[PDB]
Design a protein around this nucleic acid. Structure first.
Length: 49
DNA sequence: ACTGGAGAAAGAAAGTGAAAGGAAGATAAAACGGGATTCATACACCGTTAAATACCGGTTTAAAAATCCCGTGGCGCGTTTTAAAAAATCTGTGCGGGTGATTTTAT
């Protein structure tokens, strides 16, 4: 899974099989919904156990 | 006149019914956040080419690395406190036969 954390503190993880590889130079798809004033600071990849 | 019992007055202490109010609860309206559709529209993938960049050979030189002396504060040791977690000890409760008790209405 992949773990994301926001500045004010919000945790969540998603299955890794949802995002598919592509070629460099793209824009990508949104991974989470941000609030009015917040931003993502960390990103982690790890196993459930 | 005097005595001792008895009833009535008077006074002081305790129990009482009623008391704002305030923290401590409780209950609704509201604002919120997370899923099912619906596409148009912007994004992903495939051929072409000018241009921008990586790479090699040889200097150099100024800057950073290496070395030596020393004087301290930042870790290390030993011994106390102090919360935190764990083990030990109490407290209720229901199963089924027995003893004894309570309340409200109409005519």
């Amino acid at each position: 899974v992949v773990v994301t954390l926001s500045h004010q503190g919000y945790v969540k993880y998603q299955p890794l099989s949802e995002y598919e590889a592509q070629r460099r130079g793209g824009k990508g798809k949104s991974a989470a919904r941000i609030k009015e004033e917040d931003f993502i600071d960390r990103l982690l990849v790890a196993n459930t156990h």
